[PDB]
Amino acid sequence: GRSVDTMALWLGLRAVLVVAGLAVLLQLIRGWLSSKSYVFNREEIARLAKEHSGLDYEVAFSKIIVELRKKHPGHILQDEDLQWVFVNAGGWMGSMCLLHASLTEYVLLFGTAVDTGGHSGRYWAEISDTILSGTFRQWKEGTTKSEIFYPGDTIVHEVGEATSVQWSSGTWMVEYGRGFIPSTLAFALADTIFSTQDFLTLFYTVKVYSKALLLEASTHLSQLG
C-alpha cells in the first residue's frame, strides 16, 4: 500500500543517487588528472582588464586584445576570426567573443545587453571574470544572501563551485578559464539543444572553438619546428 510505494520510491531515489554520485566522482577523476599547460594566469588577465575598466568597454576590448596579442603571440585569434556569438546556458543569455581556447585554458570577452541570470554551471575549471562595465550579482551555494560586483572587480568561480549569476543590461567583462575545458561544453550547449534550438549558434560555437584549437596546435608545431 502506502509503505510499499514509499519503499519503491526510496529505492528509485537511491538509484538516482548512486548514478549522480558516480558521475560526480568521474568528473572529479577526469578533471583532477587533466593536463595543466598554462599560457596565461588569472591575475595577469584581471589586472589588465581592471586597468582599462574605466574606459568605454569597447575601447577596453580593443586595448586588451592588442595587449594580449603583444604578450602572447600565436595564442590569440586573428581579427578575421573574432565574432560575437550568443551563449545560452543555465537559463541565462549573454554573448562572447572568443580570443583563445585550448584543452586547458580559454580567454574570452563576455557580457550581455539584456537583464539576465541563472545557473553558473558546475565543472572542473576555475573561471574568473573582471568587470569592465555593469554589475555582476553572485549568489553562492549554501547561503541565503548574494553579493554585487562592480567595474574593476574580479569574480572567481571556483572549481566544483555552483552559484547563481545575474547580470544587468550593459554588463561586459573579460573572462579567463583554467582547468578541463571540454567538461564545460555540456553546460555551455545544453540550453541550445533543449531550449533555443538555435543550431546556427551551435555551429558558430564549435567553429570558433575548433579554430582556437587549430591555432594552438599550429603554434605548438612552429615552436617545435
Add this chain to the structure above:
Amino acid sequence: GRSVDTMALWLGLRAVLVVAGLAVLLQLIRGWLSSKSYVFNREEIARLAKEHSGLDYEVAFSKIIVELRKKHPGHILQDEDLQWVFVNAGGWMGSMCLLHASLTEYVLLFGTAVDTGGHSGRYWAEISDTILSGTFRQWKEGTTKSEIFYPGDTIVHEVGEATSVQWSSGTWMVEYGRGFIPSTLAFALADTIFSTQDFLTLFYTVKVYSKALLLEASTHLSQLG
C-alpha cells in the same frame, strides 16, 4: 598525450560542426522552397495595432479582432475557440491568444504579466510584433547594445535572425508571422518538453493550432465549393 586529446577534441568538434551546418542548410532549403500563400501582410496588421495602441490593451484586443474578422472572414477563430495559453520558449514565459494559423501565416495576441526574457528563436519565418502596451527590448546578434521599443512601435524579427528579447510586466502586442510556420514548433515547444513539463499547455497549443488549420481548410473548401 595532450596533443592526442587536442586532436580528438578537434575531430569531435568538426563532427558537431558539419551536423549543425547541414541542419542549417536543410532549414534554409525547406524554408526557401516552402509555400507562400498570404492572406495578411505585416504592414496591415502593424497599422491596425498601432492605431489602437493608445487604448487600454484589452479594448485594443477586442477592436483588432473585430476589424480582422470584418476584413478576413473565414480566417479568424470564433469566440468559442479564443483562449489564453502560456508560451514557454527560449527561456522566456508569456502567453498568446491565437487568432489565425496556417502552414504559411499566423496572427496572435501575445504578451506577459511578468518580467521575462530570453532567446527569440531562429527559424524560416518573418515575425512582426506591434506593441499595444509595455516595453520590448531587442538585442541583435553581433552587437553589444540593445534597443527598447514602446507602444506603437513594430519590431521585425527577420528570417534566420537570432536576437535576445526582453519584456516588462504588462507588455502586450499583436503578432504576425509569415514563412514556414511548422519550423517554429520545435522552438515553441522545447521549454515545455525539457523544462516546464506542462503537458496540458502542450495539449492546448497543438489543439488551437489544429483548430486554426481546420478553419483554413474549411474556408478553402467553401471557396472552391
Add this chain to the structure above:
Amino acid sequence: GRSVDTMALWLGLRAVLVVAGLAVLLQLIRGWLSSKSYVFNREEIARLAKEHSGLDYEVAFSKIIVELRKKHPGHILQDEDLQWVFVNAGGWMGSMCLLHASLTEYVLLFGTAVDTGGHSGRYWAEISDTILSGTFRQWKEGTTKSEIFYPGDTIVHEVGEATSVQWSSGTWMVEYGRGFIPSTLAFALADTIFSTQDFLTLFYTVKVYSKALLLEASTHLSQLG
C-alpha cells in the same frame, strides 16, 4: 501540394494532442487515487510563518523549525540533515532547505537571493507559500494581469493549476505541499537534466528526499512498535 502538407500537419498535431491528453488523464488518475495521509495542514504552516514574518527571515526560519519539531516530533529532519540546495526548475532558480517529505506531504524553506521567475509547474499537488521576506508575483493562466504578494501573505498554487511565478532578490518563504508528491519530481529536476547539468545538485536533492522518506518510515515503525 499545400493542402496535402496542411492535412499531414493536422494529423501530426492530432497525434501530439491525444498523447498529451492521455498523459494529462493519467496524471489525473494517479493523483486523484493517490494516498492522502496528512501530518500537517496548510493553515497551520501559514499561520506559523505569518506570525514570524516580521522577524529577520533567518530568525523566523529557526523559530519555525523549532516550533514544527515541538508539534510534530519524528517528522522533521535533524540539524545534521538540514542543507541549502539550489532548485532550478521551470526557468527559475531558487534554493530550498527540506524539513519534511513523504509520499503525500512536504515542508521546506524556499527562496532566492537573485531576481528570478518562470513556470510554476503543473502537477497533482496543492502548494502553499507564506512569505517571510521579499515579494512574490503570481500570474494565473487565462488572465492578462498578475498580482504581487508581500510578507505575511500566503499564495496557494492549486491542484492542476499553472501560473507564472516571479520573486525578487531576498525573497524567502515557508512552503507546504500536499498531494502526490513524486509527480512533482519531473518538474523539479528537468532544468537540472536539460539546462544546468549540475549533477551534484541532483545528488543533494535525491539524497535529502531519501533521508526524509527514511525518517518517515522510521517514525512509522516506532509508532507501530
